[PDB]
Amino acid sequence: RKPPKGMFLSQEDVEAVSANATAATTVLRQLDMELVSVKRQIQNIKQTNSALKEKLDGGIEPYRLPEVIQKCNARWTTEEQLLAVQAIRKYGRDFQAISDVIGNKSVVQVKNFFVNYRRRFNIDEVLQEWEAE
Amino acid sequence: PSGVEGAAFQSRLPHDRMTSQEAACFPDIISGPQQTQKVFLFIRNRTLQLWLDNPKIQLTFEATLQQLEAPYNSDTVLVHRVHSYLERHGLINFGIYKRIKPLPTKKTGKVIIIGSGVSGLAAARQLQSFGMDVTLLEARDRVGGRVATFRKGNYVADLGAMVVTGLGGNPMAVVSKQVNMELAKIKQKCPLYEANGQAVPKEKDEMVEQEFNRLLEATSYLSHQLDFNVLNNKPVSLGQALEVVIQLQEKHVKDEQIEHWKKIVKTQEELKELLNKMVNLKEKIKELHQQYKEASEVKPPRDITAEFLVKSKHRDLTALCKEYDELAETQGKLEEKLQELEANPPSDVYLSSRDRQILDWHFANLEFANATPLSTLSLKHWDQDDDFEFTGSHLTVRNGYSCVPVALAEGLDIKLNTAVRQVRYTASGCEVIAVNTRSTSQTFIYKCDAVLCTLPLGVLKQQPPAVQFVPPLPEWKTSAVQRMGFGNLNKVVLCFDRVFWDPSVNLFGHVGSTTASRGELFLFWNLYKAPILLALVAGEAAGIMENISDDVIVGRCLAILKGIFGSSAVPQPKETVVSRWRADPWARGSYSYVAAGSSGNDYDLMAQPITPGPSIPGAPQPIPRLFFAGEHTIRNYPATVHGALLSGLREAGRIADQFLGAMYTL
Ligand SMILES: Cc1cc2c(cc1C)N(C[C@H](O)[C@H](O)[C@H](O)COP(=O)(O)OP(=O)(O)OC[C@H]1O[C@@H](n3cnc4c(N)ncnc43)[C@H](O)[C@@H]1O)[C@@H]1NC(=O)NC(=O)[C@@]1([C@@H](CC(=N)Cc1ccccc1)c1ccccc1)N2
Numbered sequence: 001r002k003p004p005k006g007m008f009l010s011q012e013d014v015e016a017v018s019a020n021a022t023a024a025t026t027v028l029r030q031l032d033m034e035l036v037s038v039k040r041q042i043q044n045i046k047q048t049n050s051a052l053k054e055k056l057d058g059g060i061e062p063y064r065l066p067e068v069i070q071k072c073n074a075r076w077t078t079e080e081q082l083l084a085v086q087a088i089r090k091y092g093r094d095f096q097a098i099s100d101v102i103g104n105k106s107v108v109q110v111k112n113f114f115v116n117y118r119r120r121f122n123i124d125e126v127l128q129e130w131e132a133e
Numbered sequence: 134p135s136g137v138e139g140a141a142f143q144s145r146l147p148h149d150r151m152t153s154q155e156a157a158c159f160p161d162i163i164s165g166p167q168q169t170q171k172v173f174l175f176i177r178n179r180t181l182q183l184w185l186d187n188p189k190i191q192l193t194f195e196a197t198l199q200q201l202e203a204p205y206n207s208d209t210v211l212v213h214r215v216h217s218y219l220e221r222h223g224l225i226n227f228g229i230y231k232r233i234k235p236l237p238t239k240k241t242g243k244v245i246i247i248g249s250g251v252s253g254l255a256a257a258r259q260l261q262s263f264g265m266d267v268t269l270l271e272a273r274d275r276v277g278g279r280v281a282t283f284r285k286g287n288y289v290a291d292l293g294a295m296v297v298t299g300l301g302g303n304p305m306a307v308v309s310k311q312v313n314m315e316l317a318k319i320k321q322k323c324p325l326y327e328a329n330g331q332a333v334p335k336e337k338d339e340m341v342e343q344e345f346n347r348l349l350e351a352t353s354y355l356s357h358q359l360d361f362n363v364l365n366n367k368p369v370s371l372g373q374a375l376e377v378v379i380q381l382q383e384k385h386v387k388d389e390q391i392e393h394w395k396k397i398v399k400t401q402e403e404l405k406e407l408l409n410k411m412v413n414l415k416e417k418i419k420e421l422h423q424q425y426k427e428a429s430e431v432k433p434p435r436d437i438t439a440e441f442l443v444k445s446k447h448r449d450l451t452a453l454c455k456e457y458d459e460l461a462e463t464q465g466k467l468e469e470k471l472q473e474l475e476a477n478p479p480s481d482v483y484l485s486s487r488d489r490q491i492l493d494w495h496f497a498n499l500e501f502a503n504a505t506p507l508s509t510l511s512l513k514h515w516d517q518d519d520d521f522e523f524t525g526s527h528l529t530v531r532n533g534y535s536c537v538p539v540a541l542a543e544g545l546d547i548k549l550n551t552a553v554r555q556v557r558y559t560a561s562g563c564e565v566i567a568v569n570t571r572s573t574s575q576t577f578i579y580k581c582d583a584v585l586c587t588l589p590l591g592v593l594k595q596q597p598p599a600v601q602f603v604p605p606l607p608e609w610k611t612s613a614v615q616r617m618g619f620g621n622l623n624k625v626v627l628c629f630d631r632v633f634w635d636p637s638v639n640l641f642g643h644v645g646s647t648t649a650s651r652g653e654l655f656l657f658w659n660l661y662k663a664p665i666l667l668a669l670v671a672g673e674a675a676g677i678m679e680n681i682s683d684d685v686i687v688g689r690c691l692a693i694l695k696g697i698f699g700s701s702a703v704p705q706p707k708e709t710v711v712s713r714w715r716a717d718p719w720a721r722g723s724y725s726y727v728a729a730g731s732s733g734n735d736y737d738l739m740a741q742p743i744t745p746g747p748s749i750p751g752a753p754q755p756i757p758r759l760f761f762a763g764e765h766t767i768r769n770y771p772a773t774v775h776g777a778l779l780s781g782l783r784e785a786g787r788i789a790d791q792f793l794g795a796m797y798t799l
Binding site: 001002003004005006007008009011013014017018024027028031032034035038039041042045046048049052053055056059060063064065068079082083086087090097100101102103 | 347348350351354355358359361364376377378380381382383384385387388390391394395397398401402404405408409411412415418419422425437438440441444445447448450451452454457461
């Protein structure tokens, strides 16, 4: 019903290796060349990646900023409201980004700000200009 | 098996079913009620048991009926029919036994048997037992034919058959009780030794063997499951198939490597795209940090846009630093996945040069058993006689196999040194024309009712013929002769003054250097009481080594043995003999094999008797005149001694039926 274990013999393969006198040597060479071809392709991309790895040396260590640890506040200083309006102008509806810019406002307080100061800060106009870019 | 059921097994018969031959002789019983069949079967089985329990004395009808019980001994004509059938077809009272009723005073019919091999001698004894006039014509100065035994001093070694292939259902088991055969079991263990002269470690001595067995099953799969049996109109051989299987195993090995290194490039190229994204991000981070720095240099107090710029760029920087860290995360995963794949590659090669050589020994061994290059064997049929293999350990005849044909030859009219030249067969009878081998011009004529031809297949194959048939054998017979394979294997007998090998090791292999020479002195036997080593020449080597002198052959033998046991532990041989079976004119080979393009049916065709045309036109259909026995005629046991023995018994039965009549079929 089935070939021995670790033995490989398909109807397709038998016909290919017995198509002529040296169809055996032909098939085994096409794969011998295919192996060499793929093997040097490996060292090529190995060499390419080796150079790319060296250009990333040091990482991003001299570019990291220390962690700003500030507690979330409920009240809006005029300063914070003005930061918000500008953050909306630059980020639109990315409530996470806006929250990070202001520093001490939760993602929900940011969403609340949108409805509360909606008319007074023409947030409709501010949002429609964000989409204009 | 034991009892009456064991006796059936020991006679190669199903204990609970009637054979085709039995159906022919007892058509009344087999077509009749089941109860009678079981009575028949028991009578048959019990009679066999009686003969088997004591094969040194003749078992008569009287003695048989005496030891039978009710309700089996009630029908005496049934018992007489059964006994007669068994005696006629040589299932009981065959070989060498003491006769109770001394032979009939005058003989009926006259038979000439060509060749006093085992098949010839087996028939001769039977026909004489049936009261026929029998004369054997042997070309050699000895009986036995392909059972040849070298004898000198205390050195005794077989140049022909050597092994009893298991006693379980072997007619030679019966013979061995009748003849003083010193039967010694063969210990299976066979250590191999490479060209260098050093053992193959149990590690490799199993990778290769197991692979060999695996490669055989693979060819069987190619034959039966993929119907790969004809290629370019030519029939596929076992060798051809083994080569194709090996090539596909080498193909798969490469297929595996390709797709493994293909797994590497895909992952390596994922790394390339990631490192590009990382270099471009470290670029934006570099610039963005500068921008934040410059916005921080603007010292307070500042308006809200300037304050926003600091905060905005701060957010934008940590956001891009979030990404880069998640990209360095991915880099670690992909970077170790590459050390994963590079740690475990697939198989480098299918078989190494060392491996392929040890495999070639296993092929040589197979080429030895079948006495022929694997490229000659039929893929579909090469092992057609596997189902009929006997049970038990293989044994060797320690006192020399010749003891058997010599014992059979006793009390028989055998003309030695008599070479049959022509066989003439006509509706009225036969004449066999033979000459004296010593002075070939001295001619003999033999007139007989029947001829039993036991000429080897090699002889029958000769072109131009060594024996002429008048009229010529029919096309269906000669075509079978051509189609059938007649192989070759040779032996080298080495006689020493002392044992220098492992005495508890019966056989050990020597691995050749090339495929071409795999058969050359590949195996050595330690079987005899005396210090004798026996060297085998198989496969393509056999035919070639016959053109080389004995000294050169023994030279290569000593060379090999020195490599294995030490250059000073191997003395010069006191006596040496080399067989040349293909060269032998009375053999022209060693034994038959199922050639590519042949089948087991050809063995049946070989066994079919020849019936001459009528003398006077319009005269009734003549009696069959020319009969064939021998190793090459027995489909289920070819290329053996028991097979030859059995073919003799077969023909003697058929001939006696024809010329003395079958009184047991009524
Ligand atoms: C070296 C060698 C080794 C072994 C054998 C052969 C050789 C050579 N065999 C085969 C076995 O030896 C043979 O089959 C039988 O002995 C043959 O008996 P015939 O049919 O009677 O044929 P003859 O030639 O004897 O009689 C003919 C006579 O005619 C005369 N004459 C000629 N011309 C003229 C003329 N013009 N005018 C007048 N006369 C003429 C001739 O002079 C001659 O006298 C073995 N048989 C066996 O049972 N055991 C063995 O060990 C094995 C042997 C058996 C075997 N191979 C098993 C097997 C199984 C499945 C597939 C294939 C093979 C073996 C056992 C274990 C391991 C390896 C081998 N070894």
